[PDB]
Design an enzyme around this catalytic site. Structure first.
Site: not given
Ligand code: ANP
Ligand code: ANP
Ligand code: MG
Ligand code: MG
Ligand code: MG
Ligand code: MG
Lengths: 263, 263
Positions: A43, A189, A194, A207
């Site tokens: 990421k 989130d 996720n 995440d």
């Protein structure tokens, strides 16, 4: 010469075959790295997001602090390289929540999952949590995102049915209508893309850039939003709160859902 | 007040339901605007891409000039707002080729299609064409893109089996092996995602930011690339060239396929 990843990271990722994640919902670059023994994930976030809850460095810090507290991926390598913040991690255990559900509707099972996440989060000790995502902290960065044209790509905010004429009007509202807070571990989130499930129970979380200390109604509101737009029946929002054993605070719920519009 | 679109444009699209495009494999934001009677599309690029073959303004100029020459979307509105180049257009006529032949095992018809596009293009008078995408021009903007980290770093390039070690090495090759050019009309990104067919005939071209004057082997090379990606049957490449009625120039075909790697 000039590259987004260092020669060391390139060396670590060489044996793997790359597959750019096809979703597109945040500024981060997500890559699935398939190997002959396992899959890793890379990421990446650019300089413009440094210090924000989008920053994978911040995400890496939380990922390291959450080890032994929540089932999260292992940090294999992290670096700051030529403006970029890169994170190489292990693949999460279990099945992606959005997949386990998909078409095969099992409403109660999702609500139970979200309830399980909320309770689990409350058992977490935040005495040494690296980040405090208080409303003041979130509003400060939202101001930064708006000033630099980095806030979420307006597509819904262009419709006539929008309560606020522009991002700033929404910002001003969040700034004035700021509710009291009771800090607890917060994912930031909570959603079906996720969370990972295995044998009916949460097997992993990803995440994590927006994770840290935040009010308990933040994640709860997200669950409500997910239940309403993913399942459909409002009856499952009722079951959700029944499982939590509390009464919904609609004022705080509506606010947090609004706070996420611009992110 | 701070918006990516002007008040005028906002008013022009209120009655439409905005749904962001899922592909997003470029710097441009694409939005399908769902209306009761029709669908409109809004494509927009930020200031960092101004003047490049990605700039939607450049795409607008070519879309206007192509009117009457090629089946293209109608320009409904254009504007430069806060560094954003905004283009509101009509929905292309027909069916997307990647859908008209979606998993439909008919590789020969997509060849006939490409052959027809090449034939169509060679019929276009370029005497007053708005842009010349000569290799000098392309390599100049590529230079700018690499220097500013705005080029496309296909994650597959990080594999240990890749030809070039980094962007600049590939750039130096492209800058040194520059072939001779004979200008004709060039779409810039001829693929199954930018072409529409209605009744066994091309009904629409989109994604025209890279349109203008360029060597004929450019679009032809793109066709070869896509042919090879669909199926590992090199026999279809021969068929394609039988249809065109020409002997393939492999040095130029290879050259242009490499040029598109960093875009
Ligand atoms: N460590 C991992 N293990 C398994 N799947 C992963 C992992 N990291 C990413 N993914 C997958 O890739 C998707 C995108 O990763 P994510 O970290 O959510 O990026 P994001 O852009 O921040 N996402 P969002 O903001 O939710 O759009 C996830 O929904 C998973 O499908
Ligand atoms: N006028 C239009 N009519 C119909 N579909 C459209 C139109 N404009 C965009 N689309 C759709 O949205 C997709 C993306 O638009 P496009 O103009 O190709 O953006 P892009 O990012 O430059 N694309 P690419 O560079 O090919 O990834 C196209 O493949 C179509 O599916
Ligand atoms: Mg995510
Ligand atoms: Mg995210
Ligand atoms: Mg396209
Ligand atoms: Mg394009």
């Amino acid at each position: 010469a000039k590259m987004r990843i260092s020669p060391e990271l390139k060396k670590l990722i060489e044996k793997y075959r790359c597959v750019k994640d096809t979703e597109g919902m945040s500024p981060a670059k997500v890559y699935k790295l398939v190997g002959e023994n396992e899959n890793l994930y890379l990421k990446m976030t650019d300089s413009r997001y440094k210090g924000t809850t989008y920053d994978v460095e911040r995400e890496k810090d939380m990922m390291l602090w959450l080890e032994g507290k929540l089932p999260v991926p292992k940090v294999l390598h992290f670096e700051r390289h030529d403006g970029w913040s890169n994170l190489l991690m292990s693949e999460a255990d279990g099945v992606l929540c959005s997949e386990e559900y998909e078409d095969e509707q099992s409403p109660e099972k999702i609500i139970e999952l979200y309830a399980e996440c909320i309770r689990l989060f409350h058992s977490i000790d935040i005495s040494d949590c690296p980040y405090t995502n208080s409303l003041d902290s979130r509003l400060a960065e939202l101001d930064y995102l708006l000033n630099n044209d980095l806030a979420d790509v307006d597509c819904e905010n262009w419709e006539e049915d929008t309560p606020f004429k522009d991002p700033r009007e929404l910002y001003d509202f969040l700034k004035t209508e700021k509710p009291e807070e009771e800090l607890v571990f917060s994912h930031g989130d909570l959603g079906d893309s996720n969370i990972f499930v295995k044998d009916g129970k949460v097997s992993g979380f990803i995440d994590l850039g927006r994770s840290g200390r935040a009010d308990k109604w933040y994640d709860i509101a997200f669950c409500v939003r997910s239940i309403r737009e993913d399942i459909g029946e409002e009856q499952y929002v009722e079951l959700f709160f029944d499982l939590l054993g509390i009464k919904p605070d609609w004022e705080k719920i509506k606010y947090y859902i609004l706070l996420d519009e611009l992110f």
